[PDB]
RNA sequence: UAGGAUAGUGGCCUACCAUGGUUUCAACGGGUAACGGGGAAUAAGGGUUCGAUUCCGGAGAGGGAGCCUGAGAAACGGCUACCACAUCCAAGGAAGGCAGCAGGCGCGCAAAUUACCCAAUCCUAAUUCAGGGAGGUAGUGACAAUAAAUAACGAUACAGGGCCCAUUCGGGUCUUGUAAUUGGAAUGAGUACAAUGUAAAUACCUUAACGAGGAACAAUUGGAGGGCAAGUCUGGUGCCAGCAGCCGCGGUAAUUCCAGCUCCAAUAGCGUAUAUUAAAGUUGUUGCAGUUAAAAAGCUCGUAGUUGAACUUUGGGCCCGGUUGGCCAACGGGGCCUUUCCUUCUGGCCAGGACUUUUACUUUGAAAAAAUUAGAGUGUUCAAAGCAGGCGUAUUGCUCGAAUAU
């Protein structure tokens, strides 16, 4: 039969066996250990709002020799310090210290995205005015 | 592990690109009519059959 | 306005609400959306039953126009139309005055202010009139 | 605390977004039948998929199953009535056939192109959506109206709305009123 | 066992007595970023994830507890007390409970009006009338879902492509289009008489009078190395700035950055983040793998667990009712006979007695809430929907429905 019971009264072995073997899945483990609510600097939420402390220049390791312009952000709902990338040609001229930004992930679900060491999140909205519209010059960053 | 790259050259190429203006062009239609504009452009009077078909050639 | 048409479909006699009730199919070719007054006139001179006992409602026109279907009632008297119709249609036809009051919440606030007063309150009114000596 | 109002999606975008064959075949449909979207083809593909799965569900039973007889005859008569399914082909293995062009042929747009009266599928589409042609006395301005058998002999212009009489029309009215101003009084 | 208590059974509680009760078939404890179900998403089959939320059931009114009234409450738009908040005060005292409707603060990625009204649906009362933030109407509303504007048709013009013909000029008609000249028609987007709509309106469906020529009434979002449809065009930058889900671009001719032109894909939508489903035969019952890629316990014994050899009325013969399809076979069904209980008496499948191996499996059926799914009918103008509707003598009326399946 090669490895599993087959008889009609053997559904308990099959249930408990698959229930034991499910723990080797990465997704099932991280969904049933609650990684999202305890670890993973958000609450497991999608976006999170936080306040810029300082501006960083992260050197890209190995290839893509460049200085990726990042910021260090303290989250409002946690107090967790978090490095977040500020994407586009410019845009570190639009973020300033003690503003509020809205961070989203990188679509890599953790796992700092490209050639950037450790930066898991990107900046979406600074001062509520939406970095894409700030970089395409269709919106104006406010006063304070 | 390196965290203090200098931020001075940020926004370099975006700020030193030479600014050009968009050219005023006649309006291309929208919706159904535009698909009709694509349709004759591809199937009815397909012009360049250089090998097979090129939707966007250069100055060939 | 072209001699248009009235049709009454699905007619039921209701002797226990004292009326005829029917669907009104109105062909009005080359004319938008005839009226309600003129439909009551043209049904009162078809049922021969005194327009203030004729009621119409419903009446949304067809897509494209030229036709509109609604509902109609014809009572055996105006005296029974004044006892079986709702008051809003009897306002529409001019058969009861639109009895205006104050607002909803103004009535509710006046009710709540009456809830705090026990009795007629004229004793309380004169007693707080007596308050102005201390 | 009401009753919910149900709805449904009527289309399904395909799984591979960029296949050159499917884009060529769908622009061919959109140019032969004068469509706006690819959603106007995905809707027809949704209709085909639902009809065709229902037909397979009947084909997997035995013949003279009462559900097979009832639902097969009903689905066949509904496909025959709109003229999608032909008259000789009437036995539920022909509705597993019956491609997308058979539904896309029976729209009001293409049928208005066919019965004279429009001289183009784009002129048919604009004619329909601009408060022209009627079926009964009902003006239809839906180019996906999907005419029946017993209604395709009634596609004609409106009794309102010129090309059916009843007035010149506002650009004709204004061009007359500016013809009646400069030359005369 | 007896009592008490209760509306009543009951360790529910008390007295006396006994030592039982659950558990590897997972008790007990822990966690739940857990109210349960009808259902939702995903579409080979099997599954996998979700269900605070329109219906059903439960629970709670800041946390606990106690109680009055009543048929019904351990009620909080009732009371009493304690704790945590919190309001007025003439400082003595008083009053509190928005997880009802609207609104505010806070919280956060995250969510609307301190509007109109009982006209509809229904409920309450002493009741045809009163009341109802239940509920309906409207404002906000790109949460999703339906339909589908942003143009159509000419003619002329050079240019083809076809061809009658070619000794050798070209065009002339069947026209496909590239046209920076041009032409009259057509419509709703809006606005607006009126009418309808409505409790009163707004909107829709109707419709006078206005309202299309590009300065409009002007479609966006993402992309063009591969994956993956679509440039090796031009200028800028020079491992910088930046792009890039992944692989990779950028170090002077960058098809990948920043722009212009062109093109592509979806389109009133499109992109991004996170979660989940398919993909995933990468959780495998269907259906994985285990010599060497991850993984056969060092070895045998061994309990629960799972699994477990063959054997007992088979065959033959007669008869009867059928249901498809061309007298006929076939397909199933039933009664007899072949050594062949039918539980057995009593007097008419009843109904008193006496008893009978027990399960698993399966067919049929009951009893099965709606909504949701599947699905029948039906021209909401189509459609999503809804459960309508269709016909005549349309000045006094006829009728089919509202299936079924899971």
PDB file of N, CA, C and O (backbone and C1' of nucleotides) in Angstrom, chain E residues 15 39 94 107 122 144 186 193-195 213 255 265 290 301 342 377 383 400-401:
ATOM      1  P     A E  15     -25.341  18.879  54.765  1.00  0.00           P
ATOM      2  O5'   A E  15     -26.209  17.675  55.344  1.00  0.00           O
ATOM      3  C5'   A E  15     -26.801  17.738  56.633  1.00  0.00           C
ATOM      4  C4'   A E  15     -27.545  16.470  56.966  1.00  0.00           C
ATOM      5  C3'   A E  15     -26.762  15.180  56.834  1.00  0.00           C
ATOM      6  O3'   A E  15     -25.962  14.914  57.967  1.00  0.00           O
ATOM      7  C1'   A E  15     -28.876  14.930  55.822  1.00  0.00           C
ATOM      8  P     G E  39     -27.170  26.147   2.869  1.00  0.00           P
ATOM      9  O5'   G E  39     -27.239  27.658   2.393  1.00  0.00           O
ATOM     10  C5'   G E  39     -26.224  28.219   1.581  1.00  0.00           C
ATOM     11  C4'   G E  39     -25.863  29.597   2.060  1.00  0.00           C
ATOM     12  C3'   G E  39     -24.647  30.227   1.417  1.00  0.00           C
ATOM     13  O3'   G E  39     -24.959  30.866   0.201  1.00  0.00           O
ATOM     14  C1'   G E  39     -24.455  30.391   3.739  1.00  0.00           C
ATOM     15  P     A E  94     -29.727  63.637  47.433  1.00  0.00           P
ATOM     16  O5'   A E  94     -29.803  64.067  45.908  1.00  0.00           O
ATOM     17  C5'   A E  94     -30.937  64.762  45.426  1.00  0.00           C
ATOM     18  C4'   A E  94     -30.726  65.272  44.032  1.00  0.00           C
ATOM     19  C3'   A E  94     -30.591  64.232  42.946  1.00  0.00           C
ATOM     20  O3'   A E  94     -31.810  63.639  42.560  1.00  0.00           O
ATOM     21  C1'   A E  94     -28.932  65.843  42.658  1.00  0.00           C
ATOM     22  P     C E 107      -5.803  59.028  19.045  1.00  0.00           P
ATOM     23  O5'   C E 107      -6.151  57.525  18.698  1.00  0.00           O
ATOM     24  C5'   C E 107      -5.954  56.502  19.655  1.00  0.00           C
ATOM     25  C4'   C E 107      -6.672  55.251  19.242  1.00  0.00           C
ATOM     26  C3'   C E 107      -6.209  54.645  17.946  1.00  0.00           C
ATOM     27  O3'   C E 107      -5.094  53.809  18.146  1.00  0.00           O
ATOM     28  C1'   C E 107      -8.560  54.768  17.966  1.00  0.00           C
ATOM     29  P     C E 122     -47.893  43.551   5.492  1.00  0.00           P
ATOM     30  O5'   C E 122     -47.644  43.969   7.000  1.00  0.00           O
ATOM     31  C5'   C E 122     -47.601  43.010   8.032  1.00  0.00           C
ATOM     32  C4'   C E 122     -46.697  43.454   9.145  1.00  0.00           C
ATOM     33  C3'   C E 122     -47.339  43.737  10.483  1.00  0.00           C
ATOM     34  O3'   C E 122     -47.614  42.574  11.240  1.00  0.00           O
ATOM     35  C1'   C E 122     -45.834  45.463   9.944  1.00  0.00           C
ATOM     36  P     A E 144     -15.300  48.353  -5.266  1.00  0.00           P
ATOM     37  O5'   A E 144     -15.621  46.805  -5.210  1.00  0.00           O
ATOM     38  C5'   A E 144     -16.313  46.192  -6.273  1.00  0.00           C
ATOM     39  C4'   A E 144     -17.302  45.170  -5.788  1.00  0.00           C
ATOM     40  C3'   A E 144     -18.321  44.751  -6.815  1.00  0.00           C
ATOM     41  O3'   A E 144     -17.805  43.837  -7.753  1.00  0.00           O
ATOM     42  C1'   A E 144     -19.434  45.260  -4.836  1.00  0.00           C
ATOM     43  P     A E 186     -31.831  65.268 -38.583  1.00  0.00           P
ATOM     44  O5'   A E 186     -30.867  64.321 -37.779  1.00  0.00           O
ATOM     45  C5'   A E 186     -31.058  62.926 -37.868  1.00  0.00           C
ATOM     46  C4'   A E 186     -30.379  62.225 -36.741  1.00  0.00           C
ATOM     47  C3'   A E 186     -30.295  62.995 -35.451  1.00  0.00           C
ATOM     48  O3'   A E 186     -31.507  63.343 -34.779  1.00  0.00           O
ATOM     49  C1'   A E 186     -28.202  62.105 -35.883  1.00  0.00           C
ATOM     50  P     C E 193     -38.046  75.448 -15.161  1.00  0.00           P
ATOM     51  O5'   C E 193     -39.367  75.812 -15.965  1.00  0.00           O
ATOM     52  C5'   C E 193     -39.916  74.867 -16.862  1.00  0.00           C
ATOM     53  C4'   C E 193     -41.038  75.427 -17.678  1.00  0.00           C
ATOM     54  C3'   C E 193     -42.390  74.816 -17.375  1.00  0.00           C
ATOM     55  O3'   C E 193     -43.028  75.389 -16.248  1.00  0.00           O
ATOM     56  C1'   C E 193     -42.021  74.756 -19.699  1.00  0.00           C
ATOM     57  P     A E 194     -43.242  74.526 -14.906  1.00  0.00           P
ATOM     58  O5'   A E 194     -44.333  73.446 -15.308  1.00  0.00           O
ATOM     59  C5'   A E 194     -45.573  73.843 -15.860  1.00  0.00           C
ATOM     60  C4'   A E 194     -46.087  72.811 -16.826  1.00  0.00           C
ATOM     61  C3'   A E 194     -46.481  71.482 -16.226  1.00  0.00           C
ATOM     62  O3'   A E 194     -47.750  71.516 -15.608  1.00  0.00           O
ATOM     63  C1'   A E 194     -45.205  71.111 -18.164  1.00  0.00           C
ATOM     64  P     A E 195     -47.961  70.811 -14.187  1.00  0.00           P
ATOM     65  O5'   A E 195     -48.232  69.290 -14.558  1.00  0.00           O
ATOM     66  C5'   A E 195     -49.230  68.943 -15.498  1.00  0.00           C
ATOM     67  C4'   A E 195     -48.946  67.603 -16.118  1.00  0.00           C
ATOM     68  C3'   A E 195     -48.638  66.482 -15.151  1.00  0.00           C
ATOM     69  O3'   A E 195     -49.792  65.915 -14.573  1.00  0.00           O
ATOM     70  C1'   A E 195     -47.023  66.483 -16.842  1.00  0.00           C
ATOM     71  P     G E 213     -20.407  72.989 -33.197  1.00  0.00           P
ATOM     72  O5'   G E 213     -19.035  72.788 -32.442  1.00  0.00           O
ATOM     73  C5'   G E 213     -17.877  73.436 -32.928  1.00  0.00           C
ATOM     74  C4'   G E 213     -16.809  72.478 -33.408  1.00  0.00           C
ATOM     75  C3'   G E 213     -16.058  72.955 -34.641  1.00  0.00           C
ATOM     76  O3'   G E 213     -14.713  72.503 -34.546  1.00  0.00           O
ATOM     77  C1'   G E 213     -17.033  70.873 -35.094  1.00  0.00           C
ATOM     78  P     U E 255      20.642  49.666 -25.162  1.00  0.00           P
ATOM     79  O5'   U E 255      19.141  49.579 -25.665  1.00  0.00           O
ATOM     80  C5'   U E 255      18.443  50.748 -26.061  1.00  0.00           C
ATOM     81  C4'   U E 255      16.969  50.481 -26.186  1.00  0.00           C
ATOM     82  C3'   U E 255      16.245  50.157 -24.891  1.00  0.00           C
ATOM     83  O3'   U E 255      15.868  51.313 -24.174  1.00  0.00           O
ATOM     84  C1'   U E 255      15.628  48.612 -26.582  1.00  0.00           C
ATOM     85  P     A E 265      -3.174  45.198 -27.927  1.00  0.00           P
ATOM     86  O5'   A E 265      -3.673  44.855 -26.471  1.00  0.00           O
ATOM     87  C5'   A E 265      -3.020  43.871 -25.706  1.00  0.00           C
ATOM     88  C4'   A E 265      -3.271  44.074 -24.242  1.00  0.00           C
ATOM     89  C3'   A E 265      -4.657  44.531 -23.861  1.00  0.00           C
ATOM     90  O3'   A E 265      -5.586  43.475 -23.856  1.00  0.00           O
ATOM     91  C1'   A E 265      -3.058  45.776 -22.666  1.00  0.00           C
ATOM     92  P     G E 290      10.730   7.870  -3.825  1.00  0.00           P
ATOM     93  O5'   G E 290      11.349   7.844  -2.369  1.00  0.00           O
ATOM     94  C5'   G E 290      12.493   8.618  -2.056  1.00  0.00           C
ATOM     95  C4'   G E 290      12.822   8.528  -0.593  1.00  0.00           C
ATOM     96  C3'   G E 290      13.067   7.139  -0.057  1.00  0.00           C
ATOM     97  O3'   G E 290      14.370   6.681  -0.319  1.00  0.00           O
ATOM     98  C1'   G E 290      11.662   8.322   1.408  1.00  0.00           C
ATOM     99  P     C E 301       9.686  -9.371  15.863  1.00  0.00           P
ATOM    100  O5'   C E 301       9.235  -9.281  17.376  1.00  0.00           O
ATOM    101  C5'   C E 301       9.357 -10.397  18.232  1.00  0.00           C
ATOM    102  C4'   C E 301       9.143 -10.008  19.671  1.00  0.00           C
ATOM    103  C3'   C E 301       7.761  -9.541  20.029  1.00  0.00           C
ATOM    104  O3'   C E 301       6.864 -10.605  20.216  1.00  0.00           O
ATOM    105  C1'   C E 301       9.352  -8.120  21.011  1.00  0.00           C
ATOM    106  P     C E 342     -39.819 -18.147   4.796  1.00  0.00           P
ATOM    107  O5'   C E 342     -41.186 -17.677   4.122  1.00  0.00           O
ATOM    108  C5'   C E 342     -41.707 -16.367   4.342  1.00  0.00           C
ATOM    109  C4'   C E 342     -42.859 -16.332   5.333  1.00  0.00           C
ATOM    110  C3'   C E 342     -42.558 -16.834   6.750  1.00  0.00           C
ATOM    111  O3'   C E 342     -43.233 -16.015   7.702  1.00  0.00           O
ATOM    112  C1'   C E 342     -44.394 -18.029   5.858  1.00  0.00           C
ATOM    113  P     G E 377     -38.183  27.501 -19.893  1.00  0.00           P
ATOM    114  O5'   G E 377     -39.413  28.432 -19.532  1.00  0.00           O
ATOM    115  C5'   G E 377     -40.737  28.039 -19.837  1.00  0.00           C
ATOM    116  C4'   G E 377     -41.737  28.933 -19.157  1.00  0.00           C
ATOM    117  C3'   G E 377     -41.670  30.397 -19.524  1.00  0.00           C
ATOM    118  O3'   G E 377     -42.315  30.677 -20.749  1.00  0.00           O
ATOM    119  C1'   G E 377     -41.883  30.170 -17.184  1.00  0.00           C
ATOM    120  P     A E 383     -32.909  40.096 -20.969  1.00  0.00           P
ATOM    121  O5'   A E 383     -31.692  40.525 -20.056  1.00  0.00           O
ATOM    122  C5'   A E 383     -30.376  40.099 -20.348  1.00  0.00           C
ATOM    123  C4'   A E 383     -29.404  40.830 -19.479  1.00  0.00           C
ATOM    124  C3'   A E 383     -29.622  40.626 -18.000  1.00  0.00           C
ATOM    125  O3'   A E 383     -29.008  39.436 -17.549  1.00  0.00           O
ATOM    126  C1'   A E 383     -29.307  42.927 -18.464  1.00  0.00           C
ATOM    127  P     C E 400     -56.675  29.582 -14.567  1.00  0.00           P
ATOM    128  O5'   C E 400     -55.167  29.484 -15.047  1.00  0.00           O
ATOM    129  C5'   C E 400     -54.831  28.775 -16.226  1.00  0.00           C
ATOM    130  C4'   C E 400     -53.401  29.021 -16.618  1.00  0.00           C
ATOM    131  C3'   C E 400     -52.379  28.810 -15.521  1.00  0.00           C
ATOM    132  O3'   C E 400     -52.052  27.453 -15.325  1.00  0.00           O
ATOM    133  C1'   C E 400     -51.936  30.847 -16.627  1.00  0.00           C
ATOM    134  P     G E 401     -51.852  26.890 -13.839  1.00  0.00           P
ATOM    135  O5'   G E 401     -51.449  28.167 -12.991  1.00  0.00           O
ATOM    136  C5'   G E 401     -50.339  28.122 -12.113  1.00  0.00           C
ATOM    137  C4'   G E 401     -49.181  28.902 -12.670  1.00  0.00           C
ATOM    138  C3'   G E 401     -48.041  29.161 -11.708  1.00  0.00           C
ATOM    139  O3'   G E 401     -47.137  28.081 -11.651  1.00  0.00           O
ATOM    140  C1'   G E 401     -48.633  31.166 -12.783  1.00  0.00           C
TER     141        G E 401
END
